[PDB]
């Protein structure tokens, strides 16, 4: 009767509606996937940063070591120079007296 | 990230959309029910009509029987009258001859 | 992460599940259709029954008419016979007296 | 009829089924949320690491500045000592000749 058309359309509509539910589910699926993509990038960026850090510290440490080597080399050469001056000053004193 | 809000909304929508499904499904259920009401009516109207038919036929048959009883009663009373005439015509003939 | 797989499945399921919704909606649709068909039958059976009724009544009415006709015909023929007897009885009486 | 019970159950089912859809949609929602949380952590860990990097580089750069400064200071003091030796050796030579 007239009831049947109504029942029918109701069904038609549940039918139309679930199509929408399916489109939307597909969007939700994309969401999870893009989320996974972004996770992976960030995740890997973190690892890249930790790596630069460890590198930077290794370089820092090494350069400081390198410069510290030079410093003690120079300190040592300074002390030798400074000794030679002390020696010469004395000798020099002695000689000037010897003249007087 | 920005993906999450998208994934979220899509879920929000599948959620909103099924509500609509559920509304529609309730309509569909009403449909089947009202369809059932009309079924019952018609169904019962049929039985009512079959009953009238059987009643009408029973009445018809009985009244015809009733009228047929009267007919054979009359047919019998007719034959009797018709015999009495026959008897009387004869007797009557005899008597008129007896006079002549 | 492990969340993503879970999110995913859930979507997979909503996806699987709506398929079932759709099968079921198709069953529903068949329901209303098989039902419209049943309405039509019942509907038409009703009309057929109303027609038999009207026929039956017409026949009943006509046959009763036909028979009441016969009854008054017979009643009329009875009265005639019944008069003829009355006539003959009288004539007969007269004649028998005439002899005595 | 028998069709109505079938139409009915199919509706019943779509009804039962969507409930499941709704539960699963909630799981999907939880997924995106457990995920958004993770995004934010990672996201913020990234920033923390970029900061340590910029700090480590600043420190590195400063410490190296601090040190190479010392080296050229020493190099300068060395040259001065080394000049004083040169001066004294000469003066000293002159004096020893002056005696002879």
Answer left, alpha or beta for residue C2, where phi above 0 means left and psi between -120 and 50 means alpha.
alpha
Q: In chain B, how many domains are there?
A: 1
- Cβ distance A49 to D48 under 8 Å? no
**Chain C contact present for D10, CB below 8 A:** yes
- Give CA–CA dist C45/B43, Å, rounded: 10
Residue burial C48-85, b: 16+ Cβ < 10 Å; e: rest: ebeebbeebeeebeeeeeebeeeeeebeeebeebeebb
Q: Which of D10, D20, D35 sits opposite C4 (nearest CB)?
A: D35
DSSP at D23? H
Tokens, residue D85: 């030796």
- Give CA–CA dist D68/D65, Å, rounded: 6
Long-range contacts of B60-69 (CB under 8 A, 24+ apart): B60/C56, B60/C59, B60/C60, B60/C63, B63/C60, B63/C64, B64/C63, B64/C64, B64/C67, B67/C64, B67/C67, B67/C68, B67/C71, B68/C67
- Give CA–CA dist D17/D29, Å, rounded: 18
- Give CA–CA dist D19/B22, Å, rounded: 9
Resolution of the solved structure (Å): 2.8
**Chain C contact present for A36, CB below 8 A:** yes
Q: What is the CATH number of the domain that holds C4?
A: 1.20.5.1700
Largest CA distance in chain C: 146
| Among the listed residues A75, D79, C31, the one whose alpha carbon sits nearest the alpha carbon of residue B35 | C31
Q: Kindly report the number of other CB atoms within 10 A of residue D8's CB atom.
A: 19
- Give CA–CA dist D9/C24, Å, rounded: 9
Q: How far is D48 from chain C (nearest CA, A)?
A: 21
- Give CA–CA dist A98/C8, Å, rounded: 102
Burial bucket for residue A40 (CB in 10 Å: 0-12, 13-18, 19+): exposed
Rounded to 10 deg, the angle between the D2-99 and B2-99 helix axes is: 180
Q: Which of B75, B88, B95 sits opposite C89 (nearest CB)?
A: B88
Express the helix, strand and coil content of chain B in percent, nearest 5 each.
Answer: 100, 0, 0
- Give CA–CA dist A72/B92, Å, rounded: 187
Q: State whether C39 and A4 contact (CB < 8 Å).
A: yes
Residue ranges making up the domain that contains C87 = 1-100
């Amino acid at each position: 009767s007239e009831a049947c058309r109504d029942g029918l359309r109701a069904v038609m509509e549940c039918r139309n509606v679930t199509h929408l539910l399916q489109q939307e589910l597909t969007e939700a699926q994309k969401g999870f996937q893009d989320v996974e993509a972004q996770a992976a990038t960030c995740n890997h960026t973190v690892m890249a940063l930790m790596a630069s850090l460890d590198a930077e510290k290794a370089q820092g440490q090494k350069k400081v070591e390198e410069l510290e080597g030079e410093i003690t080399t120079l300190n040592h050469k300074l002390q030798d120079a400074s000794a030679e001056v002390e020696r010469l000053r004395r000798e020099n004193q002695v000689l000037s007296v010897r003249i007087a």
